[PDB]
Amino acid sequence: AAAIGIDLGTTYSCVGVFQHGKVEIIANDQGNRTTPSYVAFTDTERLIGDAAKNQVALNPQNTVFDAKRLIGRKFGDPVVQSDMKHWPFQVINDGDKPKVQVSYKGETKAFYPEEISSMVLTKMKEIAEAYLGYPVTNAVITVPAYFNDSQRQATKDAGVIAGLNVLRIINEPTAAAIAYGLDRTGKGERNVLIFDLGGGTFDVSILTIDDGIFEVKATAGDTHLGGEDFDNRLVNHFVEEFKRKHKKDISQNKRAVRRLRTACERAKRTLSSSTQASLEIDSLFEGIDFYTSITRARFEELCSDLFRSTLEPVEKALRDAKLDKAQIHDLVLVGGSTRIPKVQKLLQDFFNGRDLNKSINPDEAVAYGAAVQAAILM
Ligand SMILES: Nc1ncnc2c1ncn2[C@@H]1O[C@H](COP(=O)(O)OP(=O)(O)O)[C@@H](O)[C@H]1O
Ligand SMILES: [Mg+2]
């Protein structure tokens, strides 16, 4: 019985297993090595992952996402109230506990955030099981370093609802450090900086590792900065461009904007390894095709202030840990947005030419570390 490592992410989740000496990051049924943290409810079925995200434009009120922003928080919580204003789905109050309310098979039903996340965890569990060819009952699940007891508990519960014995709940930055084998240094304190630019959040952590024991020395960043913000700059740019070429504003067509958003995210992803990208959407708005392109340099310009803003939390965390740039032994890249060449440059330049540990797919580093730790704990 291999136990599994699960990164239960805000925007994407990832599952790994350590067996026969190495970590396998397990692809899902569509061949994707990470899976959106999305759960959809329709007249006839419950969809999770890619199947949920791939119908988001068609079903906005009953496609749930961002459950991680609610998990283990009270309804009265100001982050909750505030985050609520921007979701297309209803959150409601059940004894100061938030529930996401949707319609499923024709009826209004309401779920706790840990219930939604348990459906994502079940999907990651079944992904793992399809590959291993047996049931998985033990898992290590990861959380942000700043998660309080009640968010850790609610995440553990999500695991238990999913039919997993949760061997441990560990910090995301520690799991990334474990992935790179930094946990096995000894006697001396090593200082490690995790730079984590994901889909919805930006986390900088400084850890000190001394004879295998981790200490979180500083944390910083921005809980609303991530790849979604870069998708948006691109969306706004192409909306303006559509207006220029056809004198038509797609702004208010919720469906056109979501399909444009989708095309942008995919274009963006291509710009991490190519210097130009094709954007081709059939019948975007009133039967008008939108066939166009964008360069890495143009996308960089559109995002230049957001990209730069990531170095301020780095300065802050260094200050709060009372360390200079030159006392950081290792720079680890985590999150899919750190595949962006400009971002790697900014961080490497900030650190005066220092290597970045980026050999492990950054959107997988946390799951990789969880999988290593799960095997150890077993
Ligand atoms: N090659 C790439 N270039 C730029 N962004 C990417 C790339 N691959 C994935 N992403 C982005 O990474 C983000 C998801 O990051 P990930 O670490 O998987 O999830 P999470 O933030 O939920 O932990 C998304 O915004 C996605 O578009
Ligand atoms: Mg992440």
| Position in ligand 1 atom list of the atom nearest CA 273 | 1
The 3-state DSSP class for residue 108 equals: strand
CA distances from 159 to 4, 61, 97, 175, 340 (A): 12, 25, 19, 17, 32
The pairs formed by 215-220 with CB atoms below 8 angstroms and a separation of 24 or more are: 216/145, 216/171, 216/173, 216/174, 217/191, 217/320, 217/321, 217/323, 218/316, 218/317, 218/318, 218/320, 218/321, 219/145, 219/146, 219/317, 220/313, 220/314, 220/316, 220/317, 220/320
The 3-state DSSP class for residue 252 equals: coil
**What are the helix and strand counts (H, E) for the chain?**
12, 18
342 is in an annotated binding site: no
3-state secondary structure 53-103: HCCHHHCHHHEECCHHHCCCCCCCCHHHHHHHCCCCCEEEEECCEEEEEEE
Answer whether 179's CB lies under 8 Å from 194's CB.
no
The 3-state DSSP class for residue 260 equals: helix
Contacts of 80 (CB under 8 A, 6+ apart): 69, 70, 73, 74, 91, 98
Q: Taking Cα atoms as reference points, which of 49, 13, 11, 28 lies closest to residue 370?
A: 13
Pick the catalytic residue from 115, 172, 228, 330. Answer: 172
CATH H-level superfamily of 1-64+120-184+358-378: ATPase, nucleotide binding domain (3.30.420.40)
CA distances from 319 to 79, 206, 312 (A): 26, 11, 11
Given this chain, do its domains 1-64+120-184+358-378 and 185-225+310-357 carry the same CATH topology? yes
Indicate if 156 belongs to the active site. Answer: no
Pick the catalytic residue from 24, 50, 66, 196. Answer: 196
266 is in an annotated binding site: yes
Q: What residue's CA is closest to ligand 1, atom 13? A: 199
Using CB distances shorter than 6 Å, the residues near ligand 1 are 9-12, 34, 198-200, 226-228, 265, 268-269, 272, 335-337, 339-340, 363
Six-digit token string for 74: 């009270």
| Strand ranges, E, within the chain | 4-7, 12-19, 22-25, 35-36, 39-41, 46-48, 63-64, 90-94, 97-104, 107-111, 138-143, 165-171, 189-197, 202-210, 213-222, 276-285, 288-295, 330-334
The residue type found at 148 is: N
Q: What residue's CA is closest to ligand 1, atom 19? A: 12
CATH H-level superfamily of 226-309: ATPase, substrate binding domain, subdomain 4 (3.90.640.10)
Residues 4, 171, 73, 223: what is their CA dihedral angle, to the nearest 10 degrees?
-120
The residue type found at 359 is: S
Q: Can you give the resolution of this entry in Å?
A: 2.1
Indicate if 305 belongs to the active site. Answer: no
Give the fold, CATH level 3, of 65-119. Defensin A-like (3.30.30)
Pick the catalytic residue from 24, 50, 68, 83. Answer: 68
Separation CA 338–CA 351 (nearest Å): 15
Separation CA 177–CA 374 (nearest Å): 14
337 is in an annotated binding site: yes
Out of 12, 264, 361, mutate this one to test ligand 1's pocket (max ligand atoms within 8 Å of CB): namely 12
- Which backbone phi and psi does 337 adopt, to 5 degrees? -70, -20
139 is in an annotated binding site: no
Q: Taking Cα atoms as reference points, which of 118, 127, 142 lies closest to residue 67?
A: 118
Separation CA 305–CA 303 (nearest Å): 6
Give the fold, CATH level 3, of 185-225+310-357. Nucleotidyltransferase; domain 5 (3.30.420)
| Position in ligand 1 atom list of the atom nearest CA 199 | 25
Going by the DSSP 8-state scheme, the letter that residue 157 receives in this structure is: H
Domain ranges of the chain: 1-64+120-184+358-378, 65-119, 185-225+310-357, 226-309
Q: What residue's CA is closest to ligand 1, atom 21? A: 198
Separation CA 228–CA 241 (nearest Å): 20
Radius of gyration of the chain measured on its C-alpha atoms: 21
Separation CA 332–CA 156 (nearest Å): 26
Indicate if 50 belongs to the active site. Answer: no
Separation CA 7–CA 371 (nearest Å): 10
| Position in ligand 1 atom list of the atom nearest CA 271 | 3
Q: By CB neighbour count within 10 A (0-12 exposed, 13-18 middle, 19+ buried), where does 142 fall? A: buried
Answer whether 176's CB lies under 8 Å from 23's CB.
no
- Sign, CA dihedral 36-308-170-336, equals positive
Going by the DSSP 8-state scheme, the letter that residue 324 receives in this structure is: -
Indicate if 196 belongs to the active site. Answer: yes
Six-digit token string for 188: 């001396």
289 CA → ligand 2 middle, Å: 35
Contacts of 368 (CB under 8 A, 6+ apart): 5, 16, 23, 25, 175, 176, 179, 360
148: Cα within 13 Å, side-chain hemisphere: 7
| Position in ligand 1 atom list of the atom nearest CA 10 | 22
> Nearest-5° angle of CA 155, CA 156, CA 157?
90
